[PDB]
UniProtKB/Swiss-Prot annotation:
Example GO BP: negative regulation of vascular associated smooth muscle cell migration
Naturally occurring in which organism (per UniProt): Homo sapiens
Record protein name field: Tyrosine-protein phosphatase non-receptor type 1
GO cellular component, one term: sorting endosome
Annotated EC: 3.1.3.48
Organism placement in taxonomy: Eukaryota, Metazoa, Chordata, Craniata, Vertebrata
Residues of the full protein shown: 1 to 284 of 435
Amino acid sequence: GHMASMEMEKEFEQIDKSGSWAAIYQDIRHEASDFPCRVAKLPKNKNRNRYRDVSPFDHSRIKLHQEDNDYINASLIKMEEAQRSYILTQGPLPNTCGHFWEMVWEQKSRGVVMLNRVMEKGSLKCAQYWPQKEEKEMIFEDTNLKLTLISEDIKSYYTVRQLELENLTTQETREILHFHYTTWPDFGVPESPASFANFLFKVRESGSLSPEHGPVVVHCSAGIGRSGTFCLADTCLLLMDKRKDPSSVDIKKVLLEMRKFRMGLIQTADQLRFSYLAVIEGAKFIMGD
Ligand SMILES: [Cl-]
Ligand SMILES: [Cl-]
Ligand SMILES: [Cl-]
Ligand SMILES: [Cl-]
Ligand SMILES: [Cl-]
Ligand SMILES: [Cl-]
Ligand SMILES: [Cl-]
């Protein structure tokens, strides 16, 4: 509400004017939790990790319902006070797309949030894990899942797709919404915080963040930088509406809470700054400003 917005904008101005983003961001890095990632580092899981230096903590990792190997590079971020949960995961690999959709099915997720393009900077950031044409569905034979593109709505800053995910073992089918933010720049942060806040509102409006469903699945390439920005802004905005007096929300403390559940969330000072901007813009929109 009004008081939380005022204090947020105030704290932003003070950091910005004093050139403090890099120092604040270094502090967060220094203070952040360290927990073991023993399962991620097992030799049999080397081909399930996109990056050697980005791993889920054992305590918060998502387990596939698999006797063979339950490992996927994905973490449950559980925000107690805000009453929101998110699964943050790396962009699927060629050999982990079946695992990805198994996780979506097992966790009962309604939405998938993608914040990168399959190719960026001339390199593959993520496998093509969803079908691009209605008439060419995908079958994941290892996990017995079928995935059909039903429709897509292409907007200037993002695309929304309706997907149909079918468990071939049981023939149950589910509608999954794919919220694809397609315009994050190859370097730096988006020029429009408002486009990103608007994107977050479209995800919220679909019910994908709601407790009736399993946690939304959020990914970029490593699942920590852009993905961290998305969930940090969402949680901060919720808290700004939930809290009484003082109504103020401390973004650094919220980010440190989130980093208890996955390492490295928010990978640059510029992403920290962008996070504040998206929250500020989002709150103005909510208040009808
Ligand atoms: Cl092993
Ligand atoms: Cl919280
Ligand atoms: Cl893409
Ligand atoms: Cl950046
Ligand atoms: Cl990325
Ligand atoms: Cl706080
Ligand atoms: Cl870091």
